[PDB]
Design a protein around this ligand. Structure first.
Ligand SMILES: CNC(=O)c1cnc(NC(=O)C2CC2)cc1Nc1ccccc1S(C)(=O)=O
Ligand SMILES: CNC(=O)c1cnc(NC(=O)C2CC2)cc1Nc1ccccc1S(C)(=O)=O
Lengths: 249, 249
């Protein structure tokens, strides 16, 4: 990844929080600055691995990483500013007013981005609505939405059990104690999209759900029902490839 | 004339901005995303000028003219149900993107604006409010796709104070289809100066017209002869949009 100097970045309004990060609007060009918390070197390394991965990839439905600013105890990931922000926040504002054809486009754009990663044997590890950003809302007639999948943030391997339980239902069950984990994440993300930004699923309740090997609900739309059932299986090897998912969509 | 919309058919969403005697909101029409233009509690002559605008815009059909779905009457409020366009007003956009807008891009917008205005000219119909604010981007294109908005409350119903506020877009004789030629000319300058209008305080603006002073020359030399021809104080000397459209090629 590219190194950014603090002289090149301006930090503005706080947009939200990520895992171990505070997300701010900023300037470099309008950017999004992901400020890592004062961390251990493992978390800093996991954050760098994410800047590296996202700097070596290029896809229309993958948000851009400008680089990393590393000065003293601060680690700032300089990323692409996407107009309408997180998908879940949007779907929740527009509940009951989001057409099924709109949801279908977002699914296909998300699956093409994920098929690209799959072909390069690269893992995202954090596919959820929050990490799906809306470039274009596709609200006017003859316009489609345009999504860009965000960086996965601090890589999953560096996270505590407590933080992995918080990622349920998007976290693949095998990760509670592979490019197959993005198939679960994708499946749980179709459900969230279908339930208008509302996720299917307290910490103990969520852990017990996975431990008891219970399955997530069926989507509100029947079109995605077979797909979600195939994606949200506890056997990682049985999940379809995004090549198949993209064809089937 | 125009179609009548019932309040039961419209959902009023977030505020987008203000127009002359109006508050512009995003909305929904039973479901199509619309833009609601809510007229202030007004006297019958003001509401008549708003109706005249709904009528004019309902009887026209051009790709570069925004659609009018109809008019709603909600207690003392007169709502104009009009087209939702993805990227909103042009001036707002050009200001955000200053120094990053190519001259070839500005040329397309000029031609599209002149096509729309040539159509009105051929039908001996007047817009009366051609300015960047009233140019809506359906497609960004970085080519672009504009839609000229409705003129709002017709010029004839406005006070001298409100006409002084429309300077430099307001034709001096208004302090005829020839007035849209001035508006068009002042709009080329605004586009050229990246959303920045040439002119200031109310007295300063009135004195500019009273003293018969002329607006600046564009930053691009291609549009210099055209703007000079359009921004003449003699309405009869302004070229037709037939000529303007030919010359822009
Ligand atoms: C790669 N860049 C981004 O992730 C990112 C880009 N643009 C926006 N735009 C807006 O919010 C616009 C103001 C609406 C939000 C973004 N992140 C964000 C913001 C708030 C919370 C959590 C996150 S996240 C995805 O980093 O978890
Ligand atoms: C005929 N319909 C419109 O004029 C109209 C249509 N769509 C948008 N879309 C967006 O803003 C999208 C969110 C970007 C804006 C519009 N007008 C608008 C909005 C804010 C202030 C003033 C006006 S204006 C021109 O009516 O003065």
């Amino acid at each position: 990844f590219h190194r950014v100097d603090q002289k090149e970045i301006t930090q503005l309004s706080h947009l939200g929080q990520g895992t171990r990060t505070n997300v701010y609007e900023g300037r470099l060009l309008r950017v999004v600055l992901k400020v890592l918390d004062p961390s251990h070197h493992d978390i800093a390394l996991a954050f760098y691995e994410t800047a590296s991965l996202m700097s070596q990839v290029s896809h229309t439905h993958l948000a851009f990483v400008h680089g990393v600013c590393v000065r003293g105890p601060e680690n700032i990931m300089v990323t692409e500013y996407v107009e309408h922000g997180p998908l879940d926040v949007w779907l929740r504002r527009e509940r009951g007013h989001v057409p099924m054809a709109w949801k279908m486009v977002v699914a296909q754009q998300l699956a093409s981005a994920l098929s690209y990663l799959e072909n390069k044997n690269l893992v995202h590890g954090n596919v959820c609505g929050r990490n799906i950003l809306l470039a274009r809302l596709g609200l006017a007639e003859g316009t489609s939405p345009f999504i860009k999948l965000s960086d996965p943030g601090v890589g999953l391997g560096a996270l505590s059990r407590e933080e992995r339980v918080e990622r349920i239902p998007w976290l693949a069950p095998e990760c509670l104690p592979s490019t197959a984990m993005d198939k679960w994440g994708f499946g749980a993300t179709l459900l969230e999209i279908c339930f208008d930004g509302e996720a299917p699923l307290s910490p103990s309740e969520k852990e017990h759900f996975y431990q008891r090997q219970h399955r997530l609900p069926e989507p509100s739309c029947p079109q995605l029902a077979t797909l979600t059932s195939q994606c949200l299986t506890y056997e990682p090897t049985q999940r379809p490839s995004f090549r198949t998912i993209l064809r089937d969509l």
